[PDB]
Ligand binder design. Sequence first.
Ligand code: ADP
Ligand code: ADP
Ligand code: ADP
Ligand code: ADP
Ligand code: F6P
Ligand code: F6P
Ligand code: F6P
Lengths: 458, 448, 462, 444
Amino acid sequence: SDFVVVANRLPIDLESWKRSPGGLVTALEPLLRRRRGAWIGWPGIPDSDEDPIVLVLYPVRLSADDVAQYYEGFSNATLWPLYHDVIVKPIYNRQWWERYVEVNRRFAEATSRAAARGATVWVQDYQLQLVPKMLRELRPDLTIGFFLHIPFPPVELFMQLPWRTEITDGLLGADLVGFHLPGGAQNFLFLARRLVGANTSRASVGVRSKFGEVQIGSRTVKVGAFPISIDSADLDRQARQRSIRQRARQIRAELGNPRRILLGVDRLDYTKGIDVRLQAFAELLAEGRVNREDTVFVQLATPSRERVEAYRLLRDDIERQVGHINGEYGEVGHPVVHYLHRPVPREELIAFFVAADVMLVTPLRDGMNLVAKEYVACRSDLGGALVLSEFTGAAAELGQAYLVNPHNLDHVKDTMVAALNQTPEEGRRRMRALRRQVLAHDVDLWARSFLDALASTR
Amino acid sequence: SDFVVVANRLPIDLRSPGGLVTALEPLLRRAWIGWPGIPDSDEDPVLYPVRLSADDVAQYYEGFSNATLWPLYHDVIVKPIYNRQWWERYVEVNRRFAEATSRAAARGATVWVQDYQLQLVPKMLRELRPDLTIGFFLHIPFPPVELFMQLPWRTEITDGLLGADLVGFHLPGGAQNFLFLARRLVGANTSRASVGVRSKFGEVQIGSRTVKVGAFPISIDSADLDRQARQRSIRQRARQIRAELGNPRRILLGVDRLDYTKGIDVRLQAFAELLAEGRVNREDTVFVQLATPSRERVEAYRLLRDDIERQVGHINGEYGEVGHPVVHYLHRPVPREELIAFFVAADVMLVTPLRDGMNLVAKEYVACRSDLGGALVLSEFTGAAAELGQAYLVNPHNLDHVKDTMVAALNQTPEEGRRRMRALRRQVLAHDVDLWARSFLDALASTR
Amino acid sequence: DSDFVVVANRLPIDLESWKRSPGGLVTALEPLLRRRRGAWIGWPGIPDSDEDPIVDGDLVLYPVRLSADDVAQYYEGFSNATLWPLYHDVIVKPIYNRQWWERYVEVNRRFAEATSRAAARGATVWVQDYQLQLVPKMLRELRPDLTIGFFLHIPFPPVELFMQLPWRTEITDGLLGADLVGFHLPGGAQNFLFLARRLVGANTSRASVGVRSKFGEVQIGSRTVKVGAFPISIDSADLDRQARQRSIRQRARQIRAELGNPRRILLGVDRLDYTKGIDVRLQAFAELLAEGRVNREDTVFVQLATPSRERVEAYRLLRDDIERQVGHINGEYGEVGHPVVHYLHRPVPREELIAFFVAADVMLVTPLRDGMNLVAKEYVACRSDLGGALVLSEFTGAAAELGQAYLVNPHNLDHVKDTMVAALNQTPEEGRRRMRALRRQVLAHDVDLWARSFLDALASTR
Amino acid sequence: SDFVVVANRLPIDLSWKRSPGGLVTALEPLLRRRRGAWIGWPGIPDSDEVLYPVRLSADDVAQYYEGFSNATLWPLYHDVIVKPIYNRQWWERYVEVNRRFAEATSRAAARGATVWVQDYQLQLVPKMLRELRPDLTIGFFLHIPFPPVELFMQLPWRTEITDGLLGADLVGFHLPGGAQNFLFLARRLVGANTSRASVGVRSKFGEVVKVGAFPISIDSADLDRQARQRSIRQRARQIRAELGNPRRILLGVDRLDYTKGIDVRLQAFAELLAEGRVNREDTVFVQLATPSRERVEAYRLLRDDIERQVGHINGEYGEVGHPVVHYLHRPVPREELIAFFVAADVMLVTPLRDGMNLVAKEYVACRSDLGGALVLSEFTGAAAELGQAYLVNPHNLDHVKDTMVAALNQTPEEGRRRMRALRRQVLAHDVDLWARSFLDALAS
Ligand SMILES: Nc1ncnc2c1ncn2[C@@H]1O[C@H](COP(=O)(O)OP(=O)(O)O)[C@@H](O)[C@H]1O
Ligand SMILES: Nc1ncnc2c1ncn2[C@@H]1O[C@H](COP(=O)(O)OP(=O)(O)O)[C@@H](O)[C@H]1O
Ligand SMILES: Nc1ncnc2c1ncn2[C@@H]1O[C@H](COP(=O)(O)OP(=O)(O)O)[C@@H](O)[C@H]1O
Ligand SMILES: Nc1ncnc2c1ncn2[C@@H]1O[C@H](COP(=O)(O)OP(=O)(O)O)[C@@H](O)[C@H]1O
Ligand SMILES: O=P(O)(O)OC[C@H]1O[C@](O)(CO)[C@@H](O)[C@@H]1O
Ligand SMILES: O=P(O)(O)OC[C@H]1O[C@](O)(CO)[C@@H](O)[C@@H]1O
Ligand SMILES: O=P(O)(O)OC[C@H]1O[C@](O)(CO)[C@@H](O)[C@@H]1O
């Protein structure tokens, strides 16, 4: 293989198979499926095999302890809570870190058994931050690039991590290190100067331009900001099949023809602000500011990481909110909140985007968020309204949505009422400006921006 | 007035909640000393008002009555709180009830005291006015004596009740509990035989007076509930209710106050497990729970409400579709005709309390099904199970058996359902609230 | 083939190297089976042990192997998270679990199979306590030639709560395979005869049952099951003499010196168990200090708590609330170098425990419920000087023999605090009167008297 | 008066008693020198009013003080250790109470006077007092950390707090980090022209109004002479004998606050004892903790957790008559505290986040003998001046433990060496050096 991708997930998921969750699959699978090459990742279950399925995929077998301590543990109960501004208190555990080190080392060695000479390797995300340095040690001929799909925290918080130095050096084994936002890339150059003691650049980093540099002995490390997106054009087009439109109409009938339909779509994850949108909706019903008989909210929540107790805690609290709200304001035969805890099939989800008057995307912190960009591409009729949290990476590109600080609950409620009350002229004006950005900045633009930057490092 | 009823509150709120109100109201219609249901009330009256300060409500009503005695008499489902400041308020407020009873009573009058919040009234009243004839009926269970002895004030609770001429319970086993405490804790000479149902009553010597003790199981005004359930408006609304749920094959009903004695959590776990096991189709079966809010300034009541709402949102998320939940859950009282329409539409009635002195909801259902369909699933730990043996009786802690019993009731032959319904309604119609009042009062009058 | 075999879940030793096993079941029965020959079946305290027998000096033991899943679902599960909480008036909510019921069934069978191997033709078997209540019916089915006794060391709950158990019938059936069923008290005996007429439809004697006399009866076809009340005790005279040793009496003087010679010492000694009232006695102590009614400079409370069943979640929650109380009181009322509460979370050696009984001015025994409770009797036997004061919860079985203690309802905290103040301030004249009356009972009603009339009642069924 | 100080706190707390916290420990004697004026709150509801006290209702205490100040601002400014609460009623209170502080400042102020308002409870008063009295000079110093921008932007009232601060002529922080976090904000949030370069300590300021970094210290020489008293040295010995003459003493001293890391040192100590690496017979830990904000739920929950650790370690490794941890939940008198500083072989200073921490500086100034050792958390402002302490990251429990073993068994020579350099710093950079710096900038 002249070209290898390394990520924890594969594009499939074993139960028989299934699509893997998350936006890294949403974006990489359409891109790489078009590109013959190799992919290394975990089959989503413990103690599988290492036999490939044919592009070419290589499964990494993880033991029961690898999953609990590197995946559920160091990755999702240390790195994840902390990188999103310690929403949940992180846990610092030495056995999780020791297992983190060892799994990353097995990934670096699976890449080597795949990476031909001089090949181009591309490593993905927070679970695999030591692989750049490990892989260079084994394999100094490779061109290595790394993209983090989650935010990179402020310096004062990253320094909590007992292994702050080994994570930084792990990332600097690559030739190019990328982030969604210039904010993440500037956090990084700071931490390189003020922890590993390297010479870094001092200007600010640009979007797909004005890249920074770190000087590591006899090597030079490039740093950049590359905001990911979706395969905008296929989705825009898939949303125009007569079947989807006719299905959107049937959805609103199955609900008893409300005047306004509000929607949320997310993995069930404490970053996502699902609890914020429910509380704001409940206080709006309480205040008589929405009509409880012709207005309804649907929440499509995908189960995620449910053996982590911070997720089961969140699940318990969100379920309580749904029975509470319906208990007070619904009628028999007529909830005001419809709550579903499973992954919807792609075509059924597109109908929901089309049926929805108001999209609710309220994360407390999010590296990017592709649900926001998917809704915008699905509305070639220019109806709808996107209520967008400013703590997402998308608010930097989607300025024409209605933008909220999710911690100001009055601002959330105010902005929900305005989106419900927008004029046709105002809603179409915004949906046009938002659609023009998303169609121009798709996943193609993002992938060619990163790998042309990586190619220059040679 | 020559006939005086004494109860915690009055028959309208500011209709009233509980099984005490949906019983004594139709009777009475054919003085009343009670609390408005509000703080610092006025004082004008025939009704007599008892004003409670903000602190009487918290320490006498919400504290002692509903966070000490209520959980204790119900087999300590929730840990009871023994608070001597609550006891002192309880005593005080009991005294205003006795005083205003005296201001309303005539020389030689009969008085009738109701339920667990006024247990000291009889003895206080008997001292103020030994010319009165006094009755007392407890509408909640009487706990076993190894648990009643926890009370720091167990001797004083028992002394108050003995200021009466007739002490009454729903059940014999409660009447006999009370005679044990009369013999051992107050040392009085008591009867030793078992007590019958409205017969074979017992007695306790207290000076030159004999206290009658007995068992009188409360009921509903059966025949009236039957005729109102036969009307076209009700039957048309029951057809329509089922259409608004998308025409289910099978409907199950829970109806109760949101209280930790009622087993709303049990019927939800059993129903979620059945859905998980494929033993009930999530497409044509549906459950409606109608929960009246209750005592939510008490924190054990909020803790219960949070986890039932958690249950509702969890079961719908796993088995429901958008536009079709499998559990509809309402947290408000329902107008009386609307409720009767749900008794008629309901194929299976789930009454699964962990402990209940007497459940009237299960007899209301019985009385509403003159078409002889439907099915009653009934906790043995209600006083009602002693009269309604032809229901589907369960121990609500035997969860496998609870789940088994709901399937059998959902899947009965109609001939079997009609046989059981025929037997239940013979009992309920022959033993209404009118049987129960004349029975108690023919015994209270017997002590002159 | 032994002509006399005792079977209990515990053995008198526990493998961690051997230590003495916990509980008052072991304190009463051990010194008795060194005297008499016989066999003892029990579980060695860990899983996946072997079956080879053990040399306890003269005593000889049969270990019962349990797998890890036997420990979790039978021991930790059904016994101690279903039976223990429910028999103690649902102080904690029992968990009703059919798989725990299934493995409680399987293990009772394992214990009955191991006794049958050991019992000779015609032997006497004495089965102990709540872990093993299906064993008698199982053993009578294997071995109709056997004389079966069963004793329940914990209380037997009122009928209204025992009915909550989905296996109420099968537990009552399993006790009725015995030739004699014994309890501490007549209350427990009278509940059982009520459940037998009510549940299994048997014909039952309906009169009161007396103390080691006035036995009840249960008709099982052609077999008749005797029922009685037998209040366990300790080795009263041997403890009294152990306490008279110089070495024990100077350790007592030295204990008080390392506490800075307080004027008053208060002591509690129990397994860390939520039936024990340790939270109660710490709450009362703290409020007496707050109110100024006990002197913080010359009074100190010592609590000796042995870890118990620490893998059951209710027991870890209890542990953490109590440890919270300890730090809270010492930080409010203690000085640096001088706490007002001393707490140790480990078993104490027996000669060290005796010296604490001797040094202690007030013994605090405040369970919310206890089938009997032997610490109250152990303290009394030690105070041959006639000093000391016993504060005893009336919900302990021992309160029916120890009426001259300072008796409290633990739920009446105001009264508990007043009774603690009066015990600390009693005249010498008044404490000797009570201590002298308490010791007259304990020395006359010892463990020999208890086992003698239980077993002679058993041998009266042949 | 021509110098008016405004803080939530007075120097006495109500019978008048010493006020808690390090803001007063430094500036109580520092300003007992030059006379002036001071606007504060007596620590008690409804007070009737040199010192000028502000009165608060029972609603203003709950919502402005227990609520917005210590349940919104304090958790957020300390790296969201606790989840902050964002309640608009608290915020409307906080506005109205700041208004009253500013108005008492206004009667107390004459024309041209100097004002110096103190701490996070009063960030709106610089703008309020300039609109009211444009003649005054106004300075402000923040005594807690100033949070990273990604966190501060959570605040629904982010723009108002930045504008209440920009009402002053000089804004001061302990560290250049807070000084530079605050310059970015003024650019980004309010849209002002700000300087770009690193701010240095007491120099190389920024501009929008002057922005500077001013590390607060203590009154270093007065504590040192107070620590050498024969009376203090005899009590230190009396204290060691009262514990059974241990071979080593460890000492923690702080308010009972979740920022202080008291739980971290209890856990490290419990594990060293389980591992056999500390001797349960000759080594003992003393923790002196002052109650703080105990009507606020997150503090009562901390309190419960820490008491449980104390009960758990003693029942595990203590013997009857001899705990391993003595824990005291009351403020100690000054003379007896200093005696504890002199007795202790190791000082445990493990905040998860602290704006400065003067307890470390206090211990350093007491040990004129050069004995002792100071284990200090790197997330204190002090760690920037006390680099020869034994520095730890308190989230690395394994390193905290290793460092407690090395400080407990240091050579006398190693110990004296670190302590001579520590005293060199603290003796030369004291409370008065700090004050002359800010006010020169302010007077500029
Ligand atoms: N309940 C759901 N059902 C079906 N698809 C979902 C559901 N929730 C999320 N998705 C899809 O998963 C992907 C999540 O992408 P993204 O919004 O960037 O967040 P993340 O990667 O953190 O999960 C999207 O493509 C989204 O459409
Ligand atoms: N959600 C509800 N809506 C309308 N009526 C209710 C509701 N819940 C209970 N009731 C009525 O309140 C009365 C209470 O009946 P009962 O079984 O004796 O229990 P309790 O006295 O403990 O409330 C019944 O008549 C019932 O019909
Ligand atoms: N901390 C302890 N150290 C040593 N022995 C103890 C300790 N706690 C209890 N014991 C002993 O264990 C036995 C407890 O018996 P008992 O009071 O009947 O209650 P239980 O069997 O429930 O534990 C007594 O013999 C007592 O002396
Ligand atoms: N238990 C205590 N007894 C006496 N003084 C204390 C106690 N705890 C803290 N102090 C003093 O309070 C002051 C506060 O110290 P500091 O480190 O500045 O933190 P903060 O200002 O947040 O309270 C110090 O001078 C310290 O000596
Ligand atoms: O944790 P999961 O199940 O892999 O899914 C969530 C996905 O979202 C991401 O966290 C986005 O960073 C992916 O790394 C991850 O694969
Ligand atoms: O053996 P355990 O479970 O550790 O507890 C101690 C003892 O207390 C008892 O429950 C007393 O009945 C014994 O059966 C038991 O052996
Ligand atoms: O005044 P309190 O509520 O006791 O707080 C302690 C002190 O901590 C400080 O932040 C010191 O940094 C002061 O602002 C405050 O007075």
